[PDB]
Amino acid sequence: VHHDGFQTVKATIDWEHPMFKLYEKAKRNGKWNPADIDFSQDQKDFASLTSEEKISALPLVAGFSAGEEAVTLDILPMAHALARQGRLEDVLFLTTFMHDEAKHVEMFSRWQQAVGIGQMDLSVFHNDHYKRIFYEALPEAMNRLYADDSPEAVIRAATVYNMIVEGTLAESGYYTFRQIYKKAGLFPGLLQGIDYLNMDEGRHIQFGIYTIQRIVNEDERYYELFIRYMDELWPHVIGYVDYLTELGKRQQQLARTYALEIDYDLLRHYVIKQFNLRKKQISRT
Amino acid sequence: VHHDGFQTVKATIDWEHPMFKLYEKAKRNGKWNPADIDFSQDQKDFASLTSEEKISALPLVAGFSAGEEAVTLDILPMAHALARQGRLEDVLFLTTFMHDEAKHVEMFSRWQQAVGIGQMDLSVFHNDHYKRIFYEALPEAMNRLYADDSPEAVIRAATVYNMIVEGTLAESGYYTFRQIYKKAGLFPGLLQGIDYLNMDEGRHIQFGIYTIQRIVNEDERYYELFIRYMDELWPHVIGYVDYLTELGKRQQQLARTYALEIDYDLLRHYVIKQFNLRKKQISRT
Ligand SMILES: CCCCCCCCCCCCCCCC(=O)O
Ligand SMILES: CCCCCCCCCCCCCCCC(=O)O
Ligand SMILES: [Fe+3]
Ligand SMILES: [Fe+3]
Ligand SMILES: [Fe+3]
Ligand SMILES: [Fe+3]
């Protein structure tokens, strides 16, 4: 359907809009290119590993590669719905958001190629709980926005994507990668990439927070909805976390070999800490 | 609806795909930031002008500011349709495409602000023919892709957006800006921006060409459709061009003052040259 006018013809960009400022920061801090990362040492490290240690690292890479690919496809409806509501600055920022995820898909896929597992199907490490979040609830909530851009729909989409998938799982994954391999001295290329992903991620979660907080602000009954959507998802969050944990407890040889005392109980409570801390970033008032 | 799998989990990115290569080029050559452009001299130039010369430049800025804003909102359905067809590399590239246009909206709006016309409504320089292309046919063709991603729909969308709006009007506009103001010594900031826009634009038109050529390749009856959609639009193309030309012939004082012999007849045949040359870039075979 038709445009009825153009903001930057009638007026200008709202330069003071937070999403315009968050767009500006993204351009300044989003210059990194996965294609400049040197994975040659990563390749050597992965070959150096035994078959059992090789396994140790794949689940996490599995969950991330599929995750980045899901959010790259699935952020589009949000940009569409906000564009329809005339939120130009939100859209400007969202272009950086979508390119960020394209680079993230790119980064993990380069790593797989480089270390020689690109031809290996890693879908096997996606369990039921993971499929429920990523194969199902995420795309349902996002695509919903094509036909229903109510406050409710928008809140639930930001919650699933920005607060749960990014704000809870992705954050915990970044932490898990560092806890394990930055210590081991392994996969310097991957960790370079993970640090850049983690930076990008800050902007993604701030968008989620702003989006949710401005809808809560108009009517604090929506706060309750927010908490409810968080808690609806927790079981699959932890159910994936437990699954990865038990895969870990059954394949200790990467831990044995690299003198790591992998405190799965500390990863567990980091996830929890993440979940509760995302809740705290939304004010009821 | 659900994801049924993920390419970068089952396999990797197709690294040899042209849209993956075009994505790579975009990252290398898309670093420019409108916010680094110095418009201080532009501000002085615009104030230096008489009221009549001030007018001379606004139509063109009008058509561009609305144009950039239209394509920023209106490229989204293309990314959506290709994402649904599983064309991952196309999507990766399209993230650069969408960010490019966000920067283009940003560039012209900064210029208006800087020279002091941000508060002026420039919609008055959009005539009937322009509204038909930009207010109507462009969004119709793009949004169509949400419910109809047939070869026909896709060809017609690439034709309206990439071959006509970018490939014919935008290209001619870049040329018109240089012909007039690069000579006059005016608006160095704006022209800096225009040069960057022109570079970005090369990738946008190549995407259009690749998209159209791969559908023609499967069935050369679609070539005819391509030419037809080009010719359907020509009247509004030229009808805008004539309108801008007559606005120009009635406000000569920028020409008189800056020793410009503005060959509107040469701009005219540059537009035509553009139109015919876009046709030539699609092979029937
Ligand atoms: C053993 C402790 C478990 C740690 C939790 C790991 C969760 C893996 C992360 C996979 C999902 C990543 C989603 C990406 C989101 C984005 O890129 O914006
Ligand atoms: C006097 C000679 C006329 C020259 C033709 C000028 C046409 C003005 C351009 C306005 C449309 C620009 C559309 C932008 C497309 C994009 O940014 O991808
Ligand atoms: Fe990501
Ligand atoms: Fe993210
Ligand atoms: Fe543009
Ligand atoms: Fe363009």
UniProtKB/TrEMBL annotation, chains A, B:
Residues the record lists as binding Fe(2+) 3: 128-129
Residues that coordinate or bind Fe(3+) 4: 129
Stretches of the chain forming a coiled coil according to its record: none
Pfam families to which the protein is assigned, alphabetical: Ribonuc_red_sm (PF00268)
Annotated binding of Fe(2+) 4, by residue: 129
Full protein name: R2-like ligand binding oxidase
UniProt signal peptide: none
Binding annotation for Fe(3+) 3: 101, 166, 201, 204
Residues binding Fe(2+) 2, per UniProt: 101, 166, 201, 204
Keyword Manganese part of the UniProt annotation: yes
Keywords in alphabetical order: Iron, Manganese, Metal-binding, Oxidoreductase
One function term, GO molecular function aspect: metal ion binding
BP GO annotations: deoxyribonucleotide biosynthetic process
Residue numbers binding Fe(2+) 1: 68, 101, 104, 201
